[PDB]
Amino acid sequence: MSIKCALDCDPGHDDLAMIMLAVYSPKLDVQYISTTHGNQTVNKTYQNARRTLNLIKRADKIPVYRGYSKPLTRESVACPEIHGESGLGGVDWSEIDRTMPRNPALDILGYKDESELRPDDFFKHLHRLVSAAEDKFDIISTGSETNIAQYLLAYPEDAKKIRMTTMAGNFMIVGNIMPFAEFNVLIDPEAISNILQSGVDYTFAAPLDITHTVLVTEKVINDIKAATEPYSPKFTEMIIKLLFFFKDTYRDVFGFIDPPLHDPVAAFHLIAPEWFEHVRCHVDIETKGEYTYGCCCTNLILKKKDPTKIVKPDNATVCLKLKEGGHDAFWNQMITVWGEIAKEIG
Amino acid sequence: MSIKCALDCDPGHDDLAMIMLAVYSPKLDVQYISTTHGNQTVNKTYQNARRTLNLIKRADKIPVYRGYSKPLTRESVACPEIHGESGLGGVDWSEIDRTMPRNPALDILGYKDESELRPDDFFKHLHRLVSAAEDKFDIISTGSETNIAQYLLAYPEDAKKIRMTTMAGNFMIVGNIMPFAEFNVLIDPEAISNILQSGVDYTFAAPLDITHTVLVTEKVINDIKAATEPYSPKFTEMIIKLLFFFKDTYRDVFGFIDPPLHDPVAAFHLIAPEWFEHVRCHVDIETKGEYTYGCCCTNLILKKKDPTKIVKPDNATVCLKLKEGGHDAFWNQMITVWGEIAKEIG
Amino acid sequence: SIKCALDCDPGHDDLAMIMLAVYSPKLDVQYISTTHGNQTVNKTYQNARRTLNLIKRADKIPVYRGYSKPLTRESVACPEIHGESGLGGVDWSEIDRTMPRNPALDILGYKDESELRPDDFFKHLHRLVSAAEDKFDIISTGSETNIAQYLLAYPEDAKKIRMTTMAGNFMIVGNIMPFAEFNVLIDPEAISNILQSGVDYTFAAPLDITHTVLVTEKVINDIKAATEPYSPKFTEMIIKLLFFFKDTYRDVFGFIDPPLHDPVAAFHLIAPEWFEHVRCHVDIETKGEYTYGCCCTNLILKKKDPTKIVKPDNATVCLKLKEGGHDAFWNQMITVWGEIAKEI
Amino acid sequence: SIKCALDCDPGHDDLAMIMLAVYSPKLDVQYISTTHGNQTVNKTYQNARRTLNLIKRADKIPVYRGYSKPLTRESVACPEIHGESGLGGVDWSEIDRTMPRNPALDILGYKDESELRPDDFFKHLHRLVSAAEDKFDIISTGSETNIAQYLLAYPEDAKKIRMTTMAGNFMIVGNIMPFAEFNVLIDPEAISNILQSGVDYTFAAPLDITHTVLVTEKVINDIKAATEPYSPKFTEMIIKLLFFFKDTYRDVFGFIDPPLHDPVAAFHLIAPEWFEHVRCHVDIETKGEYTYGCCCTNLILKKKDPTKIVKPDNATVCLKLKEGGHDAFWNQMITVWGEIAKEI
Ligand SMILES: [Ca+2]
Ligand SMILES: [Ca+2]
Ligand SMILES: [Ca+2]
Ligand SMILES: [Ca+2]
Ligand SMILES: [Mg+2]
Ligand SMILES: [Mg+2]
Ligand SMILES: [Mg+2]
Ligand SMILES: [Mg+2]
Ligand code: NI
Ligand code: NI
């Protein structure tokens, strides 16, 4: 039936939607959430994960770990909040923050308070899960992959028993935050480079190639409303506000009429991979490039050019598109979860 | 009326079409052609330029220089012909080769034979043209830019009086020969880096962004036939064979139903720039990247994000698309030239 | 008495450094962490425990087994199927058989050494850093991967750590590569990270110094005079360890008498008055293809034009021992070897 | 008598090298090409002509003005508005006024020096390379941009060129940067290109040698004995040129007596028997951020394990002068200065 997994993320509006999908999906049995640094600090992403869980009535059920604050060998790009903005904008979190229950991780760790949380806390829990897995243990990663790189440096022999499903990278289209690279890779390219060389079974399930086709149209919004408004009009509003928080930026900067939704597509891959195309290849992560670090460079074209002249072994699976009906299936899954959450919030 | 210019290229089927357009266009007054290394040796590209000129009855009129054999600081990617293939495939050049007239460059240089041709031969001629130009002298470049980099190393003070119009690079779409870079840049990225820092007025007139939309459809072929068949059915056949020589590769490797035509678009920019969109930006050429050398990385997105936070000065113009009617205008120009050539061949 | 931790990859030199630090009454060793080197971190772990048991301290000092490879580069460790111990020239069979339980296991609540994990030392170091009045002292004489890993997990502790290292070369060339020293080039990103972190960092024992700390026949005779009357067996093994690479140093590097490296770093913590010190900005080469691990400083620019300095100082460098420093070092080492001889 | 060309950036050292090569009967200098350095290539052009006119040879030897900057990097030349000549310590006013026409102009069919272009020397070098029975000899004592540019234009000539250079440092550290020497680091891509091209390349005068070629009080007295009886004015200027950087070498680099570099390369072409030679593979660092221009060899790997060598030899390196080599060098230099004194 259900698949045990861990979520590693940097919420983040997209990651919030991914957490909702993974936690409320009966197909996924979330063991824990670990947070990482991003354009916000790891302490902020920690809080944002807990906010997400408390909004959906699960903050007392799922342990959240606060991971590493910066990349392996590069500087963080995290910005301070300027003057007491929430850091997960579009919503007032004041109530969610004050009603926040105790993090279950504290009891697992034998800690009294959150000030004792350390980046490597999740390690022993992941090792237990990896050890107990019959084949491989599933991690969904939708932020920087520093946490997993750090884990593999401490537990190198676990690489062969880990399967990663990620939102990361761009292959046949260009990048977002930099010309040819995607945020999650370029923020710590050494980490993903390390992971690909470690023996991890790695799938780029949700590169920009796919997520730029997963768009929040007026049609989607109406489907959200039909599923959520009868149970929780308040939740309806928050979801829409979160989904549309960057609508203007995506339009004005990137030419999107309707904004994309990224990270939940990775969880959807673990739920229902049959909706995705897959190809195997060797991915090199650019680390030396001055302007191109985090580029995901593949030998896919060389395979089509001259199959026999391939030298480098395949080290990854890449999903370049959803199959017909895949977009509909994704939105159906997401709307189902939002509806269930709406029923629980009331 | 007409604009004096020089062509620097690596023919190449695309470059052949560019030479035809520039030479037969009354708007462009071609002073010389210099050839460069590419996926064929500079001696082969030299021959291919002369073949082009002799096919169109101009080999006695235009001096051709044989330029540099390899990049500034990298290895050539030139391949040998395997067993006496022409090197400009789709056509038997045996007659064109044997009827080849003397290269006018030899008399300019005071040389007796082609074995005396040296890479720096074109320098003095270009310097005369640059010196005599009222404003700037126009160069059309559709291969590696090694020759122009070499020129500027010898004549640094001429940079400010040169305007380059190129087929090179990719900006908002991915690369061809490598994941994120285009052949002409990645073959000698140091050369283009040098040029952009030199003071040259540089326009990326025909990046893949445009040329991947300039497609040889059945409609185009029929228009070619209507213009050429009444005067020279033999020429009609050769043009089509040259245009379609890589049709299968473009289809099977790159998914093109109809194949692109690249290099002549750069000459069309010099003829009629009003059909092109233009934007100014700072282009960094990746030289350190292991897998991403030759990437054209711009601050275009940073301009749209935060105009006031721009630091690096603009160093290039980029043409990201043709305006409405631009494709039609391009094909009309090309077909007009092919028709005139057809009349001359008979 | 100064509380400290040792991080090392024994290693013949590191063995001598452990002996000095542990037997010196000036240093109170809280733990030893081991790192990857020419051999695996599991071998260096064993070699540290061998050292402690030889000197009758293996029941007193916890040993942690640290990280197996660099942050972002491959290990240079031989594969175990080469069968190289990393403490050659001596039969360890008795030392291995008589080995007592590692005190680390009880601290960690582990039953056996198979449970040791790279990050085990973290909580112990954090306790020591927290309790330090000023800064806590670490002696590092191998790759610095362990400390980089620690600082990635505890970035706010950087400002309360002082590192004293054997690493680098400044005014002379390198050993394993033309212009760089083994401990840096094995993980240059780690040292780069440490220098940027806020750690108070001293290059106490670069090759500049250690290549002048030579095991002469005079030194050997002084060792014998101190050790032979109490333990002739120990005398033999110390000399065999000191001279294990004598031929290579001679034939490859032109040394008539071989150097002794790592203990010089511990000697700096014991008696810094014997060392020259200069502050500067050290850049660690990480991009270079053939020069990664090079320690590049602005020392010449300081002497050229003091006011035109741009980069802030991030390190202290010891370029030479002062007059009498060599004598003082050997006196210290011989004293410790003598005390071990009396015990062991 | 060996036909050769000089490529240089005078420069006080290069001035001495020109004097040696031109006045030595063993070397038949065909031309001098100048390159960019600490000053512009136009200044080094002038400085070469100054040198020739001082020694009464400016009407005999053509001088070419080469490339103004490195292949792919920025020049490190001061801007001309600093007003630094690059041959400081001497008034050149008379030498400038009496300067005869450059013979290069007639070879090139130019009317004046304003027509000189960087690639002017190419056709002359190609004639000499073509006519050489074996290989044609180039002495290079500045950036090697000119020769790299030549080989890009004439790749098939590489196999008929022999280069003898002052460049690099191998078993000691660098000068202008921690681990690299000026002539390499100013254009490392150029030397990288040359080593890959098929040129027969000798590092005849790395810092390893030139830092042992010192202008002692003994040398100065020998200079005086040879020159003062014929031209006391020349004596003064030679000494002033030799000692122009004496204070900097002392205060920055610890030299009691300053080195003399570039003429050692010409001395190698005259009398190679005074030099040790070893063949190896030299990699020039181009990627390094702080270490570009480092000359990294496989010399240690050869001594470690001769059979495990992978990369083919691409260079000869001279790491030291043989016994009597220093004496022979100074004897040669003093002889030339004496002959100049008699003429000038
Ligand atoms: Ca995310
Ligand atoms: Ca072309
Ligand atoms: Ca060690
Ligand atoms: Ca010089
Ligand atoms: Mg679930
Ligand atoms: Mg025309
Ligand atoms: Mg002690
Ligand atoms: Mg001579
Ligand atoms: Ni081995
Ligand atoms: Ni100046």
Inspect the interface and report whether the beta carbons of C303 and D172 lie closer than 8 Å.
Answer: no
Whether omega before B12 lies within 30 degrees of 0, making that bond cis, reads yes
Helices (H) and strands (E) in chain C, counts: 15, 10
Which residue, among D213, D241, D231, D176, has the nearest Cα to D325 in the 3D structure?
D213
Contacts of B285 in chain D (CB under 8 A): none
Are C132 and C175 spatial neighbours (Cβ–Cβ below 8 Å)?
Answer: no
| A15 assigned to a ligand binding site | yes
Q: Is C134 annotated as a binding residue?
A: no
| D294/C295 touch (CB, cutoff 8 Å), yes or no | no
Q: Per the CB < 8 Å rule, is B179 touching A304?
A: no
D234 CA → ligand 10 middle, Å: 27
Is some CB atom of chain C closer than 8 A to the CB atom of D229? no
B40 touches chain D (CB under 8 A): no
Domain ranges of chain A: 1-346
Q: Give exposure, B192-210, as e/b (b: 16+ Cβ within 10 Å).
A: bbbbbebbbbbbbbbbbbb
- What's the gap between Cα A63 and its chain centre? 17
Specify the length of chain B in residues.
346
Please judge whether A156 and C68 are an interchain contact, meaning their C-beta atoms are less than 8 angstroms apart. Answer: yes
Q: Is B131 on the interface with D (CB under 8 A)?
A: no
Among D10, D8, D7, D6, smallest CA distance to D241 is for D10
Give me the count of residues in chain C. 344
User: Contact A90/A96 with Cβ under 8 angstroms?
Assistant: no
Residues 65-84 of C with CB under 8 A from A: 67-69, 71-72
- Best residue in D35, D71, D114 for a mutation probing chain B (most B CBs within 10 Å): D71
Q: Which residue is closest to C117 within chain A, CA to CA? A: A154
Q: Known catalytic residues of B? A: 262
Q: Which residue from D173, D283, D288 is facing C173, i.e. has the nearest CB?
A: D173
Q: Considering only CA atoms, which of C197, C178, C163 is closest in space to residue C292?
A: C178
SS (H, E, C) chain D: CEEEEEEECCCHHHHHHHHHHHHCCCEEEEEEEECCCCCCHHHHHHHHHHHHHHCCCCCCCCEEECCCCCCCCCCCCCCHHHCCCCCCCCCCHHHHHCCCCCCHHHHHCCCCHHHCCHHHHHHHHHHHHHHCCCCEEEEECCCCHHHHHHHHHCHHHHHHEEEEECCCCCCCCCCCECCECHHHHCCHHHHHHHHHHCCEEEECCCHHHHCCCECCHHHHHHHHHHHCCCCHHHHHHHHHHHCCCHHHHHHHHCCCCCECCCHHHHHHHHCHHHECCEEECEEECCCCCCCCCCEEECHHHHHHCHHHCCCCCCEEECCCECCCHHHHHHHHHHHHHHHHHHHC
Residues lying with their CB under 5 A of ligand 8, a single-atom ion:
D 22, 24, 27
Rounded to whole angstroms, how far apart are CA atoms A124 and C223?
A: 48
CA distance C132 to D97: 74
DSSP state of A57: T
Q: Do C178 and D170 touch (CB under 8 A)?
A: yes
SS (H, E, C) D16-58: HHHHHHHHCCCEEEEEEEECCCCCCHHHHHHHHHHHHHHCCCC
Cβ-Cβ contacts under 8 Å for D306 (sequence gap 6 or more): none
Whole-angstrom CA distances from D186 to A98, B194, C29, D138 are 63, 16, 49, 19
Provide the 3-class DSSP secondary structure of residue A176.
coil
Nearest to B44 by CA among B20, B22, B61, B69: B69
B315 touches chain A (CB under 8 A): no
Measured in angstroms, the CA of C199 and the nearest CA of chain A are apart by 16
CB contact (8 A) between residue D285 and residue C289: yes
Per CB-CB distance under 8 Å, the chain C contacts of A290 are: none
Q: Tell me the torsion sign for CA atoms B173, B176, B182, B184.
A: negative
DSSP helix/strand/coil, C315: strand
CB contacts < 8 Å between A and B, how many? 81
Q: How far is CA B174 from CA B39, B209, B260, B287, in A?
A: 20, 9, 15, 17
For ligand 1, the distance from its centroid to the CA atom of residue A35, given in whole angstroms, is 10
Partner residue facing B305 (CB), from A172, A174, A253: A253
| Positive or negative torsion for Cα C275, C276, C282, C288 | negative
Distance CA B318, CA B276 (A): 10
A181: nearest CA partner in chain B: B180
- Contact: D71, B153; criterion CB under 8 Å: yes
Is C72 within 8 Å of A194 when comparing Cβ atoms?
A: yes
Answer yes or no: do D303 and C252 touch at CB < 8 A.
yes
Q: How large is the greatest C-alpha to C-alpha distance in chain D, in angstroms? A: 62
Enumerate the H helices of chain C as residue ranges.
12-23, 41-54, 93-97, 104-108, 121-131, 145-153, 182-185, 188-197, 207-210, 217-227, 232-242, 246-253, 263-270, 299-304, 325-343
Strand ranges (DSSP E) for chain B? 3-9, 28-35, 64-66, 137-141, 162-166, 201-204, 279-281, 283-285, 296-298, 316-318
**Contacting D residues, span 104-123, partner chain B, CB-CB under 8 Å:** 117-119, 122
Q: Does D156 touch chain C (CB under 8 A)?
A: no
CA distance to partner chain D, nearest, from residue B329 (Å): 40
DSSP, collapsed to helix, strand or coil, labels residue B12 as: coil
Distance CA A49, CA A13 (A): 10
A306 is in an annotated binding site: no
Is residue A236 exposed (0-12), middle (13-18) or buried (19+ Cβ within 10 Å)?
buried
Q: Chain A residues with CB inside 8 Å of C117's CB?
A: 123, 154-155
Is any Cβ of chain D less than 8 angstroms from the Cβ of C251?
yes
Q: Which two tokens stand for residue B327?
A: 């494709």
Residue closest to D108 by CA, chosen among D127, D121, D96, D118? D121
- Six token digits for residue D173: 């550290």
> Active-site positions of A?
262
Question: Do D177 and C296 make contact, defined as CB atoms within 8 angstroms?
Answer: yes
| Size of the A and C interface in Cβ pairs below 8 Å | 47
As a whole number of angstroms, the distance between CA C47 and CA B93 comes to 75
Distance linking the first and last C-alpha atoms of chain C: 24
> Which amino acid, one-letter code, is at C118?
P
Task: Tell me whether B252 touches chain A (CB under 8 Å).
Answer: yes
**CA of C297 relative to ligand 3 center, distance in Å:** 23
Phi and psi, residue B317, nearest 5°: -105, 140
Q: Does B178 touch chain A (CB under 8 A)?
A: yes
Strand C161-165 and strand C200-203: pairing? parallel
Q: How far is the CA of D293 from the centre of ligand 3 (A)?
A: 29
Q: Could you tell me the two tokens for A198?
A: 């470690």
Q: Does the beta carbon of A179 lie under 8 angstroms from any beta carbon of chain B?
A: yes
Nearest to C304 among D252, D297, D300 (CB): D252
Q: Does A174 touch chain B (CB under 8 A)?
A: yes
Give yes or no for D283 touching C (CB within 8 A). Answer: yes
Q: Which residue of A has its CA nearest to B180?
A: A180
Torsion of CA C227, C233, C237, C242, to 10 degrees: 30
**HSE value, Cβ hemisphere, 13 Å, CA-based, for A3:** 22
Resolution in Å, one decimal place: 1.9
Question: Across the strands, what pairs with B284?
Answer: B297
Asked if the Cβ–Cβ distance from A253 to B297 is below 8 Å, we say no
Structure letter (DSSP) for residue B255: -
Nearest to C303 among D251, D290, D303 (CB): D251
- Picking from A319, A240, A236, the residue whose alpha carbon sits closest to that of residue A272 is A319
Instruction: Compute the distance between CA of residue A19 and CA of residue A338 in angstroms, rounded to an integer.
Output: 11
- Judging contacts by C-beta atoms under 8 Å, the chain C residues touching residue D297 are 178
Side by side, the strands of the sheet bearing C63-65 are C63-65, C27-34, C2-8, C136-140, C161-165, C200-203, C315-317, C278-280
Closest ligand, as measured to the CA of D76 = 10
Cα B86–chain centre separation:
20
Q: Quick check: C61 and C104 in contact, CB under 8 A?
A: no
Contact between D173 and C178 using a beta-carbon 8 Å cutoff: no
What are the catalytic residues of C? 261
Q: How was this structure determined?
A: X-ray
User: Backbone phi, then psi, for A76, in 5-degree steps?
Assistant: -65, 150
Ligand 4 centroid distance, CA of D36 (Å):
10
Ligand 6 centre from B66 Cα, in Å? 21
Which residues of chain A make contact with B286, given a CB cutoff of 8 A?
289-292
Backbone dihedral region of A6: left (phi > 0), alpha (psi from -120 to 50 degrees) or beta? beta
From chain B, the residues in CB contact with D69 under 8 A are 153, 156
Closest-lying ligand to the alpha carbon of C77? 9
How far is the C-alpha of D160 from the C-alpha of A141, rounded, in Å?
A: 59
Q: Kindly state whether B153 is in contact with chain D, defined as any CB-CB distance less than 8 angstroms.
A: yes
H or E element in which residue A95 lies: helix A94-98
